[PDB]
Amino acid sequence: KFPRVKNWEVGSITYDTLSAQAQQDGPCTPRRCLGSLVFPPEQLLSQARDFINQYYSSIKRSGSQAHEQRLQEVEAEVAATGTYQLRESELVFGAKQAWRNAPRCVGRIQWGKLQVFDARDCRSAQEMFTYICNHIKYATNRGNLRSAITVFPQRCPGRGDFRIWNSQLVRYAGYRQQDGSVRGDPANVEITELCIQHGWTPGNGRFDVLPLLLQAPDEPPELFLLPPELVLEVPLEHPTLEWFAALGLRWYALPAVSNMLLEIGGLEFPAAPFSGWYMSTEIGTRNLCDPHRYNILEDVAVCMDLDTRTTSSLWKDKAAVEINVAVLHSYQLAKVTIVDHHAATASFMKHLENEQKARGGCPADWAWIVPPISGSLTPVFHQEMVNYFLSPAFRYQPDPW
Amino acid sequence: FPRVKNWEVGSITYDTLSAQAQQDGPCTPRRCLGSLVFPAPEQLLSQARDFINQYYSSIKRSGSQAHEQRLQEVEAEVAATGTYQLRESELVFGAKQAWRNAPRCVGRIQWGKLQVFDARDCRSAQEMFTYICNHIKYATNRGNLRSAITVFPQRCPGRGDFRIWNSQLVRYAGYRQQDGSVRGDPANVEITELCIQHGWTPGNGRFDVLPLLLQAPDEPPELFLLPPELVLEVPLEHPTLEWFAALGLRWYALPAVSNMLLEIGGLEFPAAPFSGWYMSTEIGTRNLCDPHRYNILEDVAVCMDLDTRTTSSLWKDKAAVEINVAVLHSYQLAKVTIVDHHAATASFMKHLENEQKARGGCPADWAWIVPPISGSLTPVFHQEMVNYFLSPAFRYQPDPW
Numbered sequence A: 001k002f003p004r005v006k007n008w009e010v011g012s013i014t015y016d017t018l019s020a021q022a023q024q025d026g027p028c029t030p031r032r033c034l035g036s037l038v039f040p041p042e043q044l045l046s047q048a049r050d051f052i053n054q055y056y057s058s059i060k061r062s063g064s065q066a067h068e069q070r071l072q073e074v075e076a077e078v079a080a081t082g083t084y085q086l087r088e089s090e091l092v093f094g095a096k097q098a099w100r101n102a103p104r105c106v107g108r109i110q111w112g113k114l115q116v117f118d119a120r121d122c123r124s125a126q127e128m129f130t131y132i133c134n135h136i137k138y139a140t141n142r143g144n145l146r147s148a149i150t151v152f153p154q155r156c157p158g159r160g161d162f163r164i165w166n167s168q169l170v171r172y173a174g175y176r177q178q179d180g181s182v183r184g185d186p187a188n189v190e191i192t193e194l195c196i197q198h199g200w201t202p203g204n205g206r207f208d209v210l211p212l213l214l215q216a217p218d219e220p221p222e223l224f225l226l227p228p229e230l231v232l233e234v235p236l237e238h239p240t241l242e243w244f245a246a247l248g249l250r251w252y253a254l255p256a257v258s259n260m261l262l263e264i265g266g267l268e269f270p271a272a273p274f275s276g277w278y279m280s281t282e283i284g285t286r287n288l289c290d291p292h293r294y295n296i297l298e299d300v301a302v303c304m305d306l307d308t309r310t311t312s313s314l315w316k317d318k319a320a321v322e323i324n325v326a327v328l329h330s331y332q333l334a335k336v337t338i339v340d341h342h343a344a345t346a347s348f349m350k351h352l353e354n355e356q357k358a359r360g361g362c363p364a365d366w367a368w369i370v371p372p373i374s375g376s377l378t379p380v381f382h383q384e385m386v387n388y389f390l391s392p393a394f395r396y397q398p399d400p401w
Numbered sequence B: 001f002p003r004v005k006n007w008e009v010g011s012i013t014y015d016t017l018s019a020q021a022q023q024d025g026p027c028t029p030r031r032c033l034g035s036l037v038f039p040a041p042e043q044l045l046s047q048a049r050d051f052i053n054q055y056y057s058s059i060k061r062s063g064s065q066a067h068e069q070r071l072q073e074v075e076a077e078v079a080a081t082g083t084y085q086l087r088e089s090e091l092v093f094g095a096k097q098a099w100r101n102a103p104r105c106v107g108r109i110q111w112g113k114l115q116v117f118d119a120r121d122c123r124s125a126q127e128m129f130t131y132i133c134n135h136i137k138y139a140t141n142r143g144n145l146r147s148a149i150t151v152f153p154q155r156c157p158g159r160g161d162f163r164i165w166n167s168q169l170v171r172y173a174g175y176r177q178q179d180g181s182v183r184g185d186p187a188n189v190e191i192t193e194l195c196i197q198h199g200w201t202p203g204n205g206r207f208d209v210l211p212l213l214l215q216a217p218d219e220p221p222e223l224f225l226l227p228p229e230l231v232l233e234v235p236l237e238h239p240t241l242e243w244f245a246a247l248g249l250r251w252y253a254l255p256a257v258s259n260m261l262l263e264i265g266g267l268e269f270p271a272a273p274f275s276g277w278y279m280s281t282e283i284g285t286r287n288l289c290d291p292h293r294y295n296i297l298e299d300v301a302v303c304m305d306l307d308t309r310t311t312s313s314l315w316k317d318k319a320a321v322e323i324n325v326a327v328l329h330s331y332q333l334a335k336v337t338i339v340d341h342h343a344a345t346a347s348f349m350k351h352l353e354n355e356q357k358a359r360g361g362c363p364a365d366w367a368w369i370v371p372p373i374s375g376s377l378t379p380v381f382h383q384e385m386v387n388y389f390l391s392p393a394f395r396y397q398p399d400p401w
């Protein structure tokens, strides 16, 4: 009943007993595995009882007076109002658990160290903007990055929703040409057009920081320029390839995802931006080298005088490694927190072992934990993993249009 | 019907073939186990009926006289004997389909070009040896490798199985050492001990080719030395790192897997070794760099004068790329067929497109199709896939000891 899980580097065997608690049924059946797919009224009370029960076991307080009392108050609150409010500490505990439950996050060794900014008393896009700005400056911290999440008000029936329209707080512009093709980041062509179609004055640049389209309930979104001194960026140079700097590449310091939905105890927060720090392969391999992103691989290989005429020279692999070297070196020189994929996966192995003792397993998504370069050189490659949904959780959600 | 997206391009397709998946995999709606390495006449009849229907579809004769006649003939033979026998052309079609259906094979663009040797009249382990040597000779073809399978007699009531105890026809010994380390290939410690127990006089190099342990029905395994001239090998050198040759590394030309079970229409062939040609990352990344295989990564990085004291220099990634370069250059120099992971994954994308037109889908195991270095530099990384089990099929089976 409990999956046997083997590590093939060492020979060790464990059992994921935690998988027996999974809630939101995933996309797979005995007939066919869909693990590789990117995107797979008083029921509220059931998810609240369960989450409150999680909270008190976490503090060695199950079956104690305050546990009993908190069970009644949510029951009463839902009876009268239909929803309920989370206590401050519960929201902190829920936010950390949702991070701890994220199967595709390799950074979860850090799950206990998270700063939670309670923004549930917010109203209008001007208040949101200041909350976001406090987050960015606290999280950036002059390059000594600190994980943070800002929780805006929980969705309620019969009223609109708080939503940040950008997928991240810092994203670069994507503009077309006299030929369809894109200047800048092609991942952000849609939101770049929704920003121009809302007043913004588009630049002419490859690396123009987009403006925040912030949406207060039942009102049209409102643009906001970000303070340039708040958006910390790292110009990219290579330790030994002097021409690399002249390619003019940059990335931003803070990875801050602003389009996911935080779900705690049956409550839903469609605006709950969280941020950590980058793993270098996210920048160097995916954002810069993906054929549908900045797609720079051949340009670097030409500069390195590599033989791009046959794939068996492994010129793609050689250029990719040096791009990743330049990311790590640039961020370190600028004193901005960054982690390489070897360090990160080794810490995730430690996380798996910790979570085995603490909870009897850990939901992990193999295809996302294994880095996009040098996969079998990291320990997670050789580790079998079980993927399943626990709550609280971060969820994907439709765009607000 | 699962919707499947390619993220590099935007293409969208539905896998209608997956609904035909008969035998069941390890995943459920609760939990995905896709990353696990290892996931009555009436039922024999209903598998055979499905294979016969496949065969007569492929020759454009479904529902024809010959088709119904073959169905009745098979039912009659299962009634009289508890089994049935494949016609030669059914066996050929069956072996090709099994390759076509193999979810973890990136080489399936080639599935129609397969030489099938019918050894179903094989009588002893000695004859079995002669068929195997002829296989190795034909498939190696002096370095211009050809894909081939040899099919030994099917499992049948009243007799034991033919088995090849070796996991591949060509494998290097692994000797447990004085201090408890391993000399040679650690993956082969078990089979190396079995060979010695059965009368083999061991060597003590790191690249000693193992004998074959061949089992005839109801017989102990019998040892056979492969003739030196039949095992083509490739000394490994690097095009620009001249000290690399002094590592003394070698690999063999022919990947010939010999411990899998071939299942066709309910019949099982526990001995049916098959062979193709190597993709360079199997040798360079996995066989040479895996910590639990030859584990040469750190020795190579040190020789390259890389900084091995910090992970962020990416010494592992740089050393691995050069090991793969060495493999490709060495095999091309020796004029032995080999494919790099970029060419192989590009041909697999064409296979997926062929198969979507032909059958409405294609079973594929993303975590095995994506190469173990430079994953997102290949197009298969950005392609969603559906994993399921079709028959005819190659299956894992337990070791005979």
Ligand code: HEM
Pocket: A095, A099, A101, A102, A103, A104, A105, A106, A107, A108, A110, A114, A147, A148, A149, A274, A275, A276, A277, A278, A279, A282, A339, A344, A368, A394
């Ligand atoms: C502290 C350093 C962190 C690192 C190094 C890290 C690393 C990563 C990486 C590499 C991914 C893969 C995303 C992709 O490649 O598209 C990811 C996903 C994710 N991260 Fe982390 N992250 C960090 C912090 C955080 C924090 C603070 C949170 C939440 C409070 C978080 C929640 C998530 C979630 C929800 C996902 C998507 C996972 C899923 O769908 O299951 N991460 N992370």
Ligand code: HEM
Pocket: B095, B099, B102, B103, B104, B105, B106, B107, B108, B110, B114, B147, B148, B149, B274, B275, B276, B277, B278, B279, B282, B339, B344, B368, B394
């Ligand atoms: C002609 C060139 C071929 C190439 C380049 C190729 C490539 C590969 C690779 C890279 C793997 C994964 C092995 C690993 O990393 O552990 C694999 C697995 C496999 N291959 Fe191929 N192969 C070829 C020919 C063949 C042939 C001729 C057959 C059978 C007729 C075959 C059947 C299989 C099977 C059964 C597996 C295990 C897959 C599974 O468990 O679903 N391959 N192949």
Ligand SMILES: Cc1cc(N)nc2cc(-c3cccc(CN)c3)c(F)cc12
Pocket: A255, A256, A257, A274, A275, A276, A277, A278, A279, A282
């Ligand atoms: C917080 C954080 C840090 C980091 N270093 N990386 C992160 C990546 C994502 C992410 C999750 C799903 C999809 C995508 C885009 N493919 C990104 C994310 F939400 C948060 C991340």
Ligand SMILES: Cc1cc(N)nc2cc(-c3cccc(CN)c3)c(F)cc12
Pocket: B255, B256, B257, B274, B275, B276, B277, B278, B279, B282
């Ligand atoms: C035919 C063929 C060619 C090749 N070039 N490679 C092959 C690799 C395997 C294989 C299957 C399961 C596990 C392993 C070891 N990871 C290898 C296999 F069966 C056949 C292969």
Ligand SMILES: C[C@H](O)[C@H](O)[C@H]1CNc2nc(N)[nH]c(=O)c2N1
Pocket: A036, A037, A038, A367, A368, A369, B007, B381, B382, B383, B384, B385
């Ligand atoms: C198709 C495939 O599932 C998709 O490209 C996934 C694979 N693994 C990934 N892993 C990470 N960390 N991030 C990603 O965006 C993806 N993309």
Ligand SMILES: C[C@H](O)[C@H](O)[C@H]1CNc2nc(N)[nH]c(=O)c2N1
Pocket: A008, A381, A382, A383, A384, A385, B035, B036, B037, B367, B368, B369
């Ligand atoms: C546990 C993990 O799934 C395992 O190490 C797999 C991953 N993908 C693989 N892919 C290929 N082609 N070959 C392998 O041996 C493996 N090993």
Ligand SMILES: [Cl-]
Pocket: A255, A282, A287
């Ligand atoms: Cl990003």
Ligand SMILES: [Cl-]
Pocket: B255, B282, B287
């Ligand atoms: Cl091999």
Ligand SMILES: [Gd]
Pocket: none
């Ligand atoms: Gd030059």
Ligand SMILES: [Gd]
Pocket: B240, B241, B242
């Ligand atoms: Gd040299």
Ligand SMILES: [Gd]
Pocket: none
């Ligand atoms: Gd040495």
Ligand SMILES: [Zn+2]
Pocket: A028, A032, A033, A034, A035, B027, B031, B032, B033, B034
């Ligand atoms: Zn699955």
